[PDB]
Design a protein around this ligand. Structure first.
Ligand SMILES: C[C@@](CCc1ccc(-c2ccc(OCCCN3CCOCC3)cc2)cc1)(C(=O)NO)S(C)(=O)=O
Ligand SMILES: [Zn+2]
Length: 299
């Protein structure tokens, strides 16, 4: 059987919010079967809890934001990508401020902190959302699509009209049966344009942004002294973002995602369309891991 997973021990981390620039304390706690991932604002009295589900996404400007009334949890995509990649179904995510810490700009530090603590398999079958029919959303020149596939595969195409992006890999495809999320996706960092820093800052975005937590792109080069971790790091980060955003379904997917210049807004619109079209999906479990089309690393 493919079992549900939680954390073996409590995990603590500190950082700054990419967009707010605020210092934040993060705690990851084990949770019972069928809890899902629940964010908690512990700096508030009373404490506000927000399940990490598509219905709770309130803003998609330059990150995915969870909203409950006037309470927000910003930039959940990188932590959710780490949790999806490691197969964590149930956990409590406590935060001392309105934004998840950016860390090094990738899912790498989250994956390491989680794997250092270890995972705990739970006595319940892990539920998956299996894609039965193609579901596609478009808006202008952007496209996000779910296609049936017996496993989990992500394809992505970006197209930035900038010298640092031309001649560089702008398309990547990753099948999770033959490719490790940890090795090939988790370390891909977020990126931004230095030209836009003053504009973004006037919109309350990228206030904590620097070479320490992002690939900062200048007019003709990457500013980061040590360069890139991957030649295709930019498109690999978009795959990391898609994995995190898709995890807002509340379960792992059995299918294929294809992104064409898409981002947080369109990824959430694709989940809303899928959720609504009940003939395009179903909940499945694998009562025998020996015959399942997917496998997870040892806990
Ligand atoms: C939305 C998205 C990007 C988020 C994002 C947005 C902006 C920046 C960003 C932009 C400029 C910058 O210059 C800092 C200026 C520093 N200067 C340099 C010159 O010296 C003084 C300091 C630092 C950081 C970084 C990341 C994401 O990852 N969401 O998850 S994406 C990849 O999907 O588009
Ligand atoms: Zn990102």
């Amino acid at each position: 059987m493919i079992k549900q997973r939680t954390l073996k021990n409590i995990i603590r981390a500190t950082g700054v919010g990419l967009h707010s620039g605020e210092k934040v304390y993060l705690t990851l706690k084990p949770a019972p079967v069928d809890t899902g991932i629940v964010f908690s604002r512990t700096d508030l009295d009373p404490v506000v809890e927000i399940p990490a589900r598509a219905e709770n996404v309130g803003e998609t400007t330059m990150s995915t934001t969870l909203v409950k009334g006037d309470v927000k949890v910003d930039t959940v995509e990188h932590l959710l990508s780490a949790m999806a990649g490691l197969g964590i179904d149930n956990a409590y995510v406590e935060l001392s401020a309105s934004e998840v810490p950016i860390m090094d700009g990738s899912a790498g530090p989250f994956v390491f902190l989680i794997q250092s603590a270890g995972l705990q398999e739970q006595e319940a079958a892990k539920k998956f959302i299996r894609i039965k029919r193609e579901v596609s959303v478009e808006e202008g020149d952007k496209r996000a699509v779910f296609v049936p596939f017996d496993g989990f595969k992500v394809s992505f195409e970006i197209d930035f009209d900038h010298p640092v992006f031309r001649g560089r890999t702008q398309q990547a495809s990753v099948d999770f049966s033959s490719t490790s999320f940890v090795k090939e996706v988790s370390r891909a960092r977020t990126f931004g344009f230095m030209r836009d820093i003053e504009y973004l800052r006037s919109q309350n975005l990228a206030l904590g942004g620097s070479v320490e937590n992002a690939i900062v792109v200048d007019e003709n080069r990457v500013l980061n002294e040590d360069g890139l971790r991957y030649e295709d790091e930019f498109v690999k980060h978009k795959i990391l973002d898609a994995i995190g955003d898709l995890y807002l379904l509340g379960n792992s997917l059995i299918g294929e995602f294809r992104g064409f210049k898409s981002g947080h807004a369109l990824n959430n619109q694709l989940l809303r369309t899928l959720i609504a079209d009940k003939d395009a999906w179903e909940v499945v479990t694998f009562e025998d891991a020996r015959t399942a089309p997917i496998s997870y690393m040892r806990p």
